[PDB]
Ligand binder design. Structure first.
Ligand SMILES: [Mg+2]
Ligand SMILES: [Mg+2]
Ligand SMILES: [Mg+2]
Lengths: 375, 376
C-alpha cells in the first residue's frame, strides 16, 4: 500500500449496456469498468458499483479524481487514500465511494503487477487458495413463483455453497410458502440466505421473521434500513438469526457504529462500493475483533469486481461466503477470460499478478453504451 | 399542495459557477450548481444543489439523467416526483444524489408556487412568519491569522445579525480558547456565539476544549464528532450542558429518525439543498418538533436560490432555529440575482412573490460559470 506507483498517464472507462441473458432470466445492469495506465506503462483494472441513473455521474467523478491525482509523481495506494480523505472533507455517499473504489482497485492491481504478486498475496502472507461462494437468485424482470423455483433447482444442481433468495412477496402466507418450497428443493442442509431488501412495513417484517425461523435461514439480510441502527439491534436481539447489513452504505464511521451498537453479525458492503480495499480490509479486521464476518456484496460484473472480492475473501480470517450472480457469468466471459473458476461450492482464484484480469477491450467497447479514454 | 399538477417538463438548464472572490476578497466562493426547469406550459422553476468539491459535474449529470427520466411523466407533481425518486433509488442514497434530487424538487416547488400564484411559504403552511431570524457564519478558505478573523468578526458585529458562528479549533487548546475569548470581547455577552468544531480528529482535544469553553456561553456546539458516530454524539451531549448540532453532512429521513430515537442532538442542520428535498426537510422538522429538537438549516450554497428555499422553509415551521447566512456571499449573489429577501439586522425578510421569488440575469450567471448544460 506504500508501493510507489509513479505518475498516472491514461484513463479508460466503459459503461456496458444492459444485456439479456441467453436463457432470458435477467438483464445485466450497466457495469462501470475502468483501466488506468501509469507513466511506466503498467495497467490496472477497477470497477465501480453502478447505480441506476447515476452511472455517467459516477464515471464523471472518476474522471475528475483521475485528473487531480494523475500528476502526483509518487502516487501510492496510501497517498491516493489520504488525498481522497482530504478532498472529501467528510462528505460521503455511495456514488462517490463507488468512484473512489474503482480507482483504488486499479491501484491495487497495478501494485500487484509491480511486486509480481496476486492481490491476495499482497494482503496476507498465506492466502486461502479456494473461496467459498454462494449464488444469488434474482431478476430485474417480473417472475412468478415457479419461474424462481425452476432457477433455484438449476442452482441447486451446481452445488454452490449456498443460495440467496428474496422471499418478501405479496403476503405473509405466500412469502413463507415460497421459503417452504425452496426448502423442498435444497433440503435442510444447504445454506439458504434470505434477502428481505428493506420491507417498508416493520410489522410485516416482524411477522415474517416469527414465521420463518422454522426453516433455519442461514442469514437475514437487510430486514430494516441500514441506517436504522436501533431497529437492527432490536431485530438482531429479538430473533436468533444472523443479521446482514451494509451493501447500501459506505465509510468506516457507519460500520464502526454498527459494531458499537451490536447491530449486525455479518457486514456486506459492496466490494466496489465501500470506498476501496483499504477500508474493506480495515473494517474486516475490526469486525473480526468483534465476532462479525464479512460477506462482500457483488452486484457487479463477474470480472474485475468478482476478482477483487475473491482476493479479499481469501485474505481475511472472518470471510463469509462470497456472492456470485450466475446469470452474469456468461456475459462477463464475453470480454474477460475470468481469473477464477467455480468448482461446486468454491472459487479457485489466480496466482498471477494483481487481479489476473485479461480483457478483450475491442469486445468490451462493442458492449458499451458510454466510454472515456483520456491521457 | 404536493399534488399540484405540473405536467410534462420541456427544458433543463444547469450552471456550475466558477470560484470567484467573495465580498471584500474575504474568501473564494465555492462552485454553485443552480438549475432552471421549464415545464411544457412554460412555467419556470429554479433549484440549487448542495455542491461538493470534485463532484459538481457528477451532480449535474445526475440531475440531467433524472430530468430525462421524469420529463415525459404527463401528470408530474412534487409528490409523484418524490415517489419516483424513492422507487428508482431503491435505498441507495448519499450526499451527491440527495443534492441532485434537492435541486429538482426545489424547482418543482417554485413551479408549484407559480401555478398557485403564491409564495412557497404559503404553500407550506397557512400563516407563515414573514421574517426569519438569521446568524452569520465567519469562515474562509484563504490563509489568514486570528487577527484577520477578528476584524471580520467586528464587521459582522456592526451588522447586528442574530448571531455569529466561528470555527475555533486552532493550533492548540489555549490558542483556540484565546480566540473564543477575544471574539466574546468584540461581540459582548448577549450575542449568540455559535461554535463549529468541524469534526475534530482527536476526541480528547474536543473534550478539553469543551471543558474550557463553557464559560464563554456558546449558543451551540456544531459537529463536535462525526454525525454518523451516534454513540459519540450521545456521549458528548450527555457530558456537556451545551446545545449539540449535527446533520449538515448527512441526508435521508432514516439517519435523522435514528438521531431522534437516540436523543443524540438538540438541533439538526441538514443543508437546505442537500437533504434530498423540501418534503424531507419538512417531515424531519415535524418529527424533531414533537421531540423537542429544533432545525437550523445549513446553507453553504449561493445566497440566491438555496437561501430563498431555506427562508421559506424556516418561516413555515414552528421549531426553526436561526437560519445560516454567509454575508460574504451576499453581494456576489447580487451580481446575478435580485435577491428575494432583505437582511435587516437580525432577520431576513422574505418577499411576497410567487414560489421562491427568483429573478436571475442568466447572461451574468453564464459569464460567472465554468460549466453549463442545456437539455430538452
Ligand atoms: Mg441484499
Ligand atoms: Mg458486540
Ligand atoms: Mg458546520
Amino acid at each position: 500500500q506504500d508501493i510507489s506507483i509513479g505518475k498516472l498517464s491514461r484513463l479508460k472507462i466503459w459503461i456496458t449496456d444492459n444485456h439479456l441473458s441467453d436463457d432470458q432470466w435477467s438483464n445485466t445492469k450497466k457495469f462501470i469498468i475502468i483501466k488506468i495506465t501509469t507513466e511506466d506503462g503498467i495497467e490496472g483494472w477497477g470497477e465501480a458499483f453502478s447505480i441506476n441513473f447515476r452511472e455517467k455521474g459516477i464515471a464523471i467523478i472518476i474522471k475528475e479524481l483521475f485528473r487531480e491525482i494523475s500528476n502526483i509523481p509518487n502516487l501510492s495506494i496510501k497517498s491516493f487514500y489520504n488525498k481522497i480523505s482530504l478532498l472529501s472533507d467528510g462528505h460521503r455517499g455511495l456514488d462517490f465511494s463507488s468512484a473512489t473504489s474503482a480507482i483504488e482497485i486499479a491501484l491495487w492491481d497495478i501494485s500487484g503487477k509491480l511486486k509480481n504478486l496476486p492481490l491476495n498475496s499482497l494482503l496476507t502472507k498465506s492466502p486461502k487458495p479456494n473461496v467459498p461462494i454462494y449464488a444469488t437468485c434474482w431478476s430485474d424482470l417480473k417472475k412468478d413463483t415457479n419461474d424462481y423455483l425452476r432457477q433455484i433447482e438449476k442452482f441447486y444442481g451446481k452445488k454452490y455453497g449456498g443460495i440467496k433468495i428474496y422471499p418478501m412477496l405479496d403476503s405473509l402466507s405466500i412469502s413463507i410458502q415460497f421459503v417452504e418450497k425452496v426448502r423442498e428443493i435444497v433440503g435442510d442442509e444447504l445454506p439458504l440466505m434470505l434477502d428481505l431488501a428493506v420491507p417498508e412495513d416493520l410489522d410485516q417484517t416482524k411477522s415474517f421473521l416469527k414465521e420463518v425461523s422454522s426453516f433455519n435461514p442461514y442469514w437475514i439480510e437487510e430486514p430494516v434500513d441500514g441506517e436504522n441502527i436501533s431497529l437492527l439491534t432490536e431485530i438482531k436481539n429479538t430473533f436468533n438469526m444472523k443479521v446482514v447489513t451494509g451493501e447500501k452504505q459506505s465509510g468506516l464511521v457507519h460500520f464502526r457504529e454498527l459494531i458499537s451498537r451490536n447491530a449486525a453479525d455479518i457486514f456486506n458492503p459492496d466490494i466496489s462500493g465501500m470506498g476501496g480495499l483499504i477500508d474493506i480490509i480495515e473494517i474486516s479486521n475490526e469486525a473480526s475483533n468483534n465476532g462479525i464476518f464479512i460477506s462482500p456484496h457483488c452486484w457487479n460484473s463477474m470480472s474485475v469486481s468478482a476478482s477483487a472480492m475473491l482476493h479479499v475473501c481469501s485474505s481475511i480470517p472472518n470471510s463469509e461466503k462470497a456472492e456470485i450472480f450466475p446469470d452474469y457469468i456468461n456475459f462477463s466471459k464475453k470480454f474477460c477470460e475470468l481469473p477464477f473458476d467455480i468448482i461446486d461450492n468454491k472459487a479457485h482464484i489466480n496466482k498471477s499478478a494483481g487481479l489476473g484480469i485479461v480483457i478483450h477491450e475491442d469486445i468490451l467497447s462493442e458492449l458499451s453504451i458510454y466510454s472515456l479514454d483520456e491521457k
